[PDB]
Amino acid sequence: NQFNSAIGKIQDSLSSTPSALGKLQDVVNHNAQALNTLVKQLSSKFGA
Amino acid sequence: FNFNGLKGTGVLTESNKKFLPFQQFGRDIADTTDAVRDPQTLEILDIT
Numbered sequence: 194n195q196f197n198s199a200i201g202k203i204q205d206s207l208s209s210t211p212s213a214l215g216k217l218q219d220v221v222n223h224n225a226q227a228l229n230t231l232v233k234q235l236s237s238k239f240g241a
Numbered sequence: 242f243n244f245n246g247l248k249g250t251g252v253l254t255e256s257n258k259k260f261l262p263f264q265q266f267g268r269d270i271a272d273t274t275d276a277v278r279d280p281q282t283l284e285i286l287d288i289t
């Protein structure tokens with residue numbers, strides 16, 4: 194019974210809105226931001 | 242193509258954007274032309 198209750202309660206804590214999976218969100222965030230900087234910087238005169 | 246002074250290659254298609262009367266060629270994030278009002282027939286095209 195204790196095992197079943199704990200397995201049940203895992204899902205609620207995961208579903209709580211705090212950043213439980215921030216460690217996996219940061220990967221997509223870093224990638225998207227790096228590519229976006231690369232494209233946005235293609236519009237600079239650099240002294241031209 | 243060479244619209245009015247631009248140059249380069251692309252595929253000119255129909256568009257759905259709406260340009261104000263003063264509002265002649267659109268632009269994108271990296272600051273490159275990607276729309277244009279064709280001079281004679283005042284259509285709006287998309288350059289890709």
Ligand SMILES: *[C@@H]1O[C@H](CO)[C@@H](O)[C@H](O)[C@H]1NC(C)=O
Binds near residue numbers: 281282
């Ligand atoms: C000439 O230009 C006018 C407006 O500038 C346009 O209405 C007309 O269709 C043009 N004639 C052509 C492209 O033969």
